[PDB]
Structures are given as C-alpha cells and as structure tokens.
C-alpha cells in the first residue's frame, strides 16, 4: 500500500519548499495531497507563483490520517499555519498517532504555536531560530536536516531536496530515496 | 530599470525547474512573466503540480522583448516547447537580438528543434544528451551549468538553483547573485 502525504498550502508559502517535496515525494511513489488551508482556490505563494491545490484542507482532513504531514515555510505561510485551528487539530492527531511531522524554514514555528513535539531537537532557517526557541521548548540544531522523535525539520529552500529525500527515506526506505535521488543531478 | 524574464510554461514542464528559477529571479528583483504556452489556463506539470500562469504566451509576446527567455525541462514539457511555432518565433527573435536564452534538463532539446544557437557548448540532463547531440550541432558539456555565446544550459532539478543564480548573475551581476544566494541555505 502506498504511503500518503498531506502538504498544507497557505497564502505566502515558499513555493520552492512546497513544490520540491511534492514532486520528489511523487517520484518516490507517495500519494501526495496538496491541501489548501483557505479552501479549494488557487494559492498565491511568497514569490507570487500561484498553485492550485488538489483539495481544500477541510476535505483532505476527511481522507486522513496520513503517513506524513508537511509544513512548508515562507514566513507569511508559516504564520497562517500557526494561526489555524484546523492545522492545530491535524498536527495533534498526527502526534497522538506517532506519525511523521515534517517542517521547513519558518514552517517549524507552527509546531511551537500548536505546542507540538516539545523537547525535540529541531532546526529552522537561521532567521527563524529566535522565534522557534522562545521558551526553550526545543533543542536547536544547525544540521541541514534534523530528525528527533516524530519531528523532521530543515532549514531553507536550499535544503529542500535533502528534506524531501529524508521524508522519502522515512516512508519508503533508503534504497527508494537513493533511486529517486540519482536522476535529479544533485551535488 | 529592472531586467525582465519570460518563462515559458507548457504541459508536462518539470515544476521544480519552473518554480526555482521563477522564485530566485524574483528574489533578484527581476520582473518575471510565467507565460502559458497553451493559453491563460492553469498548467499541469510533470508531477501534477498545477500552476496558474501570469499570462498566455500570446499576450506575453506582445510585451517583449525580454532580457532572458527561460525554457524549463520535463521531457513532455520540452517536447511541447519543441513543437511550438510560437516558441520558435520567440527564440529566433531573442537570438537575433543577442539576448540570453536559458534552458534546463531536456529544455535544451527545444533549441535543437528550433535551430537555435548551433555551435554552442551545451549541457542537458544525461538522458537528453543523445537527443540534443543528434547531428553534432552543439558541443556537449558535463558541467552543471554551461554558458556559451547566447546560450545558458543546465542539467536537472538538482542544478536548478545553480542555473537560476547563473541567470541572475548574467542579468544583475555577481554581487546580487551572491546576496540572493546566502539566505537560501544552499550547500
Ligand atoms: C524561509 O523560506 C522562511 O520560511 N523564512 C525565510 C526567510 C526569512 C529567509 C529565507 C528563507 C526563508
Ligand atoms: C528533466 O527534468 C528532463 O527534462 N528530463 C528528465 C529526465 C528524463 C529525468 C530526470 C530529470 C529530467
Ligand atoms: Cl519568507
Ligand atoms: Cl521528465
């Protein structure tokens, strides 16, 4: 049975941090749902790329749970995720069931907002560190990708391939990740 | 005056190779037009990410010329670009005016199709080499990014940041490219 990923797409999401994981996960044979926070309508990302979601979050929630819940960054996207009671509910559920939660750049700050994964070692974008560390609820890491307990985090657009491949490894194993990686022409 | 980029978006385009250059160029202050080959409607990319173009190609052509014309890859996207008389016209015009032409992965095969830049040193995805080299009209390179005469080429999703930053350097200079690069958290 194929693994399933939920990628939550909010206004102001970093479009690279959205598309790279979506695409790489699909290359891995993961069934990915790009779910619009606001509804079914197209989403204006941080650098004005407009992406049509596969479904509203409301509807995608009905088809859960998922093997991974993915939170892109972009400061304003992460802020929208942080303010959402629907996101809170999804993440709490995922945490309760011991499922993978993945977040990149400023995305991990939504974990703080929703009180998810306290005590975990995490990374963020350098510019998001102080926000993430308010209260000392996590242990900070400068690794490009970090993973502790349920929580997989990464730093920025430039770590998005590494982040995506870590998700692939967690869901489908090291061999599939390596097979997906090779045709990408990564460094 | 800001530099201007035309990114031609066809069905089957590799969405990473589309979004990374769009986003990075916008970070550089370049005015980017994502132009839909088929018209104004949303475009289903290779891994099913759906992107709404800024304009149809028909309309974007009217606002040219541009400082760079960018051809994403994705085999089926590149094939659609290769078959298009409108693309032929745009590239011929850009070549005639000694403007930058940039293409990635299988994207450079559209240059072959349209007889653009013969004699240039080029790279492609490894799997697109034999197509690109049919007739020996170009000189092949294994560099991650290659640039010769008017023609800037690159290899794959994993070289997209390098490709984008090369475009930024060509248009806006080395210092802007470096400033845009730093916050990305590239290796
Ligand atoms: C991330 O994409 C993000 O979420 N925030 C941020 C900043 C402030 C700079 C560069 C990259 C990013
Ligand atoms: C490129 O994106 C492309 O245009 N073609 C291709 C192939 C065949 C494999 C991996 C990446 C790419
Ligand atoms: Cl941001
Ligand atoms: Cl392809």
Curated annotation (Swiss-Prot), chains A, B:
GO cellular component, one term: endoplasmic reticulum
SUPFAM superfamilies: Class I glutamine amidotransferase-like (SSF52317)
Function: Multifunctional protein with controversial molecular function which plays an important role in cell protection against oxidative stress and cell death acting as oxidative stress sensor and redox-sensitive chaperone and protease. It is involved in neuroprotective mechanisms like the stabilization of NFE2L2 and PINK1 proteins, male fertility as a positive regulator of androgen signaling pathway as well as cell growth and transformation through, for instance, the modulation of NF-kappa-B signaling pathway.
InterPro entries according to UniProt: Class_I_gatase-like, DJ-1, DJ-1/PfpI, Prot/Nucl_acid_deglycase
Reported modifications of this chain: Sumoylated on Lys-129 by PIAS2 or PIAS4; which is enhanced after ultraviolet irradiation and essential for cell-growth promoting activity and transforming activity.
Residues the record lists as N6-acetyllysine modifications: 147
Free-text tissue specificity from the UniProt record: Highly expressed in pancreas, kidney, skeletal muscle, liver, testis and heart. Detected at slightly lower levels in placenta and brain (at protein level). Detected in astrocytes, Sertoli cells, spermatogonia, spermatids and spermatozoa. Expressed by pancreatic islets at higher levels than surrounding exocrine tissues.
EC number: 3.1.2.-, 3.5.1.-, 3.5.1.124
UniProt-reported outcome of changing residue 45 to A: Reduces protein stability. No effect on oxidation. Reduced localization in lipid rafts
Protein's recorded name: Parkinson disease protein 7
Residues at the site labelled Cleavage: 148-149
Effect of substituting residue 178 to T: No effect on detoxification activity on methylglyocal-adducted CoA
Lipid-binding residues (covalent, S-palmitoyl cysteine): 45, 52, 105
Keywords: Acetylation, Autophagy, Cell membrane, Chaperone, Copper, Cytoplasm, Disease variant, DNA damage, DNA repair, Endoplasmic reticulum, Fertilization, Hydrolase, Inflammatory response, Isopeptide bond, Lipoprotein, Membrane, Mitochondrion, Neurodegeneration, Nucleus, Oxidation, Palmitate, Parkinson disease, Parkinsonism, Phosphoprotein, Protease, RNA-binding, Stress response, Tumor suppressor, Ubl conjugation, Zymogen
Glycyl lysine isopeptide (Lys-Gly) (interchain with G-Cter in SUMO) cross-link site: 129
Co-factor: note: Deglycase activity does not require glutathione as a cofactor, however, glycated glutathione constitutes a PARK7 substrate.
Outcome after substituting residue 105 to A: Abolishes enzymatic activity. Abolishes oxidation, association with mitochondria and protease activity. No effect on chaperone activity. Reduces binding to OTUD7B. Removes the glycations and restores histone 3
Localization in the cell: Cell membrane; Cytoplasm; Nucleus; Membrane raft
Stated induction or repression of this protein's expression: By hydrogen peroxide and UV irradiation. In pancreatic islets, expression increases under hyperglycemic conditions. Expression is also induced by sulforaphane, an isothiocyanate obtained from cruciferous vegetables.
Family to which the UniProt record says this protein belongs: Belongs to the peptidase C56 family.
